[PDB]
Design a protein around this nucleic acid. Structure first.
Length: 937
RNA sequence: ACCCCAAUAUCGAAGGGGACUAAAACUAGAUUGCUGUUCUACCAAGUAAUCCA
RNA sequence: UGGAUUACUUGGUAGAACAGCAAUCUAGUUUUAGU
């Protein structure tokens, strides 16, 4: 409620005053010649006299305003201008905020904690002048960026609604993510290509300044990788490059990032763009990878041989695309499943079959039919004007609510009444509601079905020996009866470029931009980003040379074959690397009775004969950074025993004790729902010193026999992770998350350097400008000086004096645009090149710690006060998946390049259960996160 | 622990919001363990051929 | 008669495709209560 009741060319003439007076360095004298007029240190004395009573209430600000009336003339004794009156305003309101915070501090010296701040202990501080200059700078900076934001997005300022502080506050948080996604495809497409010459081992900018002689790299590319590019018509036979990188994928790539960075919402580009037959190629790639229902020969079409028309009735159930909100309220399939199994064991029309292994076939054929049926009876949508025996949900509303009540939310309101009754001390209400809905669905099933539960006719494993053997061994069986299991259309080029980018990145990068097309569409309540939110949901669900055209397990033969062949992509280099690393693991330096890696890496005949396939080793031989990541886990791998299969005490874990611990942790997650945490804590600690009421629980021997079994399953899962190489994925995950999270704020700074230039062009301070097309950088750099104010920036200036005045102003705010000042350092000593080109994943540990770059981005974003701790809070949420954060320590002020013993008080061992146990790999992943951030070698 | 709120250089704004705390269903994912069907490889016991007799 | 080139029977094991269940964590949506 600040801007649009004021600033009628009046705040503008105050900001225009403060800018050219911070430039001339005058406020740091004005502030003390003004604040000396405030008389202090007797007000402190009468504050001491009133706190000698111990008031801390509504009688103190009157004393402060009375002393203000003594000092400042409350009568209009003077004729000061609006600027100096606003300095008075800022100082008086800041002192008001400090005195209310010191009164809540005086409250917080006599309560149960005594954090002390004495009043006379702080005088020569921000009281005199430390932070009020920062306050004036933040005021002027917020108004300059506020002007430049509206100028950038070409908004008429007079017609600004408050609603456009919600329409536009979310369409650029999405654009930071759409720029950080646009540059992590620039590094993925540098692992495919390089330049024509061998000596260039750097990155290309495909999206921007284009260049010819850009050809394939014959390493690190897989058949699944090269097949996508070969199917997208990027490469032809003999691996040459087609002319779609000069007419189709280049031009459509650069225009999108131009329209995102420059915020050009002018029109659509041209009709000469990606038309529909250029999109059917990507449609074909999405078609030929998804699963076919005909390709499901594994729920065994011998269970429904004589019932081969009930599923035609199932497939004739009509559904429509409402995706209704009456699915949040019905309990899910996990609760109706035991009752459907018990209904199968209630039918008096079927018998004990042959034995215990005949009917597991039948149950695994039947649960897939019941699970897909439950989502077609709910979604059974609207109908014509003679439909008598009707849908499931109307009997549900008939059981919940009375008649003349069908067109009203009785399900929603009845769940809300059950939840209100739950919140008044009646914990049973939600389970009672779920049991009523379940018995309603059971009563609906028994009268319209159970002909599908009729298993009178049965073959007692007598012909299903060779029923499906004869069904597969014979071809042309067109009557593979299926389940339909409820189209991909791309509209415009934004969809067309994000889909191609989304089939070129890792499966965690799409979760970063799917959730941001989601949370933007929830914020605006629209449905514009709906064709993109589901194309990203079908590509996240897709995750030929597997064993046919793949691993022979005799590694002499295939390396010799693909040496003498010059399965073509299976280069002998990666096979020899895989060979060498497994040989490094299995070679017993302790050459004794020790073959502990048997059946894990080799099938009972080792030493260069046979080698078992592993996918968390073979999918890390190939990235160009492998041996740096691999070096700090390999000694931990080569020292863990084989307690897995060598003894009884590792097969009693794979069969019995894991399920017992899950059963104990499933009979408390249902006993302890809907209770406050004080009750759960006073019960969860009595479970530790229990001496008679663990026998009423699942196991016995109250807590020692549970913790020993938890320790044994814990060390089993310790050993399973490293021998399967389940830490070479966590490290790559951490590196790509940290580099993503730093490139976010490095794009934010590039946006704010547009807002600065626009907000100071409106104010007439950096006037006589111009627009230079093609280059997409806000400010000029000294790269190619003596005339650098014109060319190397999106905005042109007039003379060099205008750029020098602009640089003086930005240095006054705290943004240094000089030579070599952590911005214009030449290569990789600038933050803009080490992070906006993704070198934390491409080349780790190279001359910089990770924790020494978090500081260099948390200090480049220190010119604003709202960005305070916006990087220690944004980066350290990556690690909450594996360690606990201490947020009270993390909101404070610190640094990481020095300040020893700080990564131990900022993160804790992840203590996890609903019995509050500790995690199985807490210490190892904690020490591995600490050593990843700080290693310089 | 930060932002905004007036008759405002100042005059019960000597206050009030964002906000936290806890609990439900539903959705999506990662790891581990289990169940079912096909395909492949390895090891062990068995049935059935010369050859050495 | 024993070593030996053979074909298939179950039986541990291990990989790949698909379907289902349970535990732990993470992100989200709708909602309830109180301060």
């Amino acid at each position: 409620e600040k801007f649009k009741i004021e600033r009628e060319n009046k705040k503008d003439k105050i900001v225009k005053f403060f800018v050219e007076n911070i430039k001339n360095n005058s406020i740091k004298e004005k502030i003390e010649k003004i604040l000396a007029e405030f008389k202090i240190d007797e007000l402190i004395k009468k504050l001491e006299k009133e706190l000698k009573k111990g008031n801390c209430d509504t009688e103190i600000f009157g004393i402060f305003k009375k002393h203000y009336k003594v000092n400042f003339d409350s009568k209009k004794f003077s004729k000061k201008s609006d600027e100096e009156k606003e300095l008075y305003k800022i100082i008086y309101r800041y002192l008001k905020g400090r005195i209310e915070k010191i009164l809540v501090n005086e409250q917080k010296v006599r309560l149960k904690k005594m954090e002390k701040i004495e009043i006379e202990k702080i005088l020569n501080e921000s009281i005199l002048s430390e932070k009020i200059l920062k306050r004036v700078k933040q005021y002027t900076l917020e108004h300059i960026m506020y002007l430049g934001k509206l100028r950038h997005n070409d908004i008429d300022m007079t017609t600004v609604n408050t609603d456009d502080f919600s329409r536009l506050h979310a369409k650029e948080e999405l654009d930071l993510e759409l720029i950080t996604f646009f540059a992590s495809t620039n590094m993925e497409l540098n692992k495919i290509f390089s330049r024509e010459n061998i000596n260039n081992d750097e990155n290309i900018d495909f999206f921007g300044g284009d260049r010819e002689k850009n050809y394939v790299l014959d390493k690190k590319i897989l058949n699944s990788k090269i097949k996508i590019i070969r199917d997208l018509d990027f490469i032809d036979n003999k691996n040459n490059i087609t002319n779609n990188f000069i007419r189709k994928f280049t031009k459509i790539g650069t225009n999108e990032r131009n329209r995102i960075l420059h915020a050009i919402s002018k029109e659509r580009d041209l009709q000469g763009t990606q038309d529909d037959y250029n999109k059917v190629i990507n449609i074909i790639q999405n078609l030929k990878i998804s699963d076919e229902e005909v390709s499901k020969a594994l729920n065994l079409d011998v269970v429904f041989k004589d019932k081969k028309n009930i599923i035609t009735k199932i497939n004739d159930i009509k559904i429509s695309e409402e995706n209704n909100n009456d699915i949040k309220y019905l309990p899910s399939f996990s609760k109706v499943l035991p009752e459907i199994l018990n209904l199968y064991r209630n039918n008096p029309k079927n018998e004990p079959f042959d034995t215990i292994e005949t009917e597991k076939i039948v149950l695994n054929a039947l649960i897939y039919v019941n699970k897909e049926l439950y989502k077609k009876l709910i979604l059974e949508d609207d109908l014509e004007e003679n439909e008598s025996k009707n849908i499931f949900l109307q009997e549900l509303k008939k059981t919940l609510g009375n008649i003349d009540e069908i067109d009203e939310n009785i399900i929603e309101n009845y769940y809300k009444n059950a939840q209100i009754s739950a919140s008044k001390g009646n914990n049973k209400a939600i389970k009672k509601y779920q049991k009523k809905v379940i018995e309603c669905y059971i009563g609906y099933l028994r009268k319209n079905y159970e002909e599908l539960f009729d298993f009178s006719d049965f073959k007692m494993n007598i012909q299903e020996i060779k029923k499906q053997i004869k069904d597969i061994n014979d071809n042309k069986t067109y009557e593979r009866i299926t389940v339909k299991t409820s189209t991909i259309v791309i509209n415009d080029d934004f969809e067309y470029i994000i889909s191609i980018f989304a089939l070129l990145n890792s499966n965690a990068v799409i979760n970063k931009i799917r959730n941001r097309f989601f949370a933007t569409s929830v914020w605006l309540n629209t449905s514009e980003y709906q064709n993109i939110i589901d194309i990203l949901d079908e590509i996240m669900q897709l995750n030929c040379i597997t064993e046919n055209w793949n691993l022979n397990l005799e590694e002499f033969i295939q390396k010799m074959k693909e040496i003498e062949k010059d399965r073509i992509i299976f280069n002998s280099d990666f096979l020899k690397k895989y060979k060498k690393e497994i040989d490094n693991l299995i070679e017993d330096m302790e050459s004794e009775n020790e073959n502990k890696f048997q059946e894990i890496y080799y099938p009972k005949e080792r030493k260069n004969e046979l080698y078992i396939y592993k996918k968390n080793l073979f999918l890390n031989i190939g990235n160009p950074n492998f041996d740096k990541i691999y070096g700090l886990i390999s000694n931990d791998i080569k020292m863990a025993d084989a307690k897995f299969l060598f003894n009884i005490d590792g097969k009693n874990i794979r069969k019995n004790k894991i399920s017992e611990i899950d059963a104990i942790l499933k009979n408390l997650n249902d006993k302890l729902n809907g209770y406050s945490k004080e009750y759960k804590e006073k019960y969860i600690k009595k479970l530790k010193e229990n001496d008679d009421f663990f026998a009423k629980n699942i196991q016995n021997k109250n807590y020692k026999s549970f913790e020993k079994d938890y320790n044994r399953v814990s060390e089993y899962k310790k050993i399973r992770d490293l021998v399967e190489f389940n830490y070479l994925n966590k490290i790559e995950s951490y590196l790509i998350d940290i580099n993503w999270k730093l490139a976010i704020q490095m794009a934010r700074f590039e946006r704010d350097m547009h807002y600065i230039v626009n907000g100071l062009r409106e104010l007439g301070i950096i006037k006589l400008s111009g627009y230079n097309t093609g280059i997409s950088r806000a400010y000029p750099k000294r790269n190619g000086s003596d005339g650098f104010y014109t060319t190397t920036a999106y905005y042109k200036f007039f003379d060099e004096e205008s750029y020098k005045k602009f640089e003086k102003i930005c240095y006054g705010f705290g943004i240094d645009l000089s030579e070599n000042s952590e911005i214009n350092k030449p290569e990789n000593e600038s933050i803009r090149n080490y992070i906006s080109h993704f070198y934390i994943v491409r080349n780790p540990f190279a001359d910089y710690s990770i924790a020494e770059q978090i500081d260099r981005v948390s200090n480049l974003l220190s010119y604003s006060t709202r960005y305070n701790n916006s990087t220690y809070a944004s980066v350290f949420e990556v690690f909450k998946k594996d360690v606990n954060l201490d947020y009270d320590e993390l909101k404070k002020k610190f640094k990481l390049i020095g300040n020893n013993d700080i990564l131990e008080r900022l993160m804790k061992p992840k203590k996890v259960s609903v019995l509050e146990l500790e995690s199985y790999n807490s210490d190892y992943i904690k020490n591995l996160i600490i050593e990843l951030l700080t290693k310089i070698e």
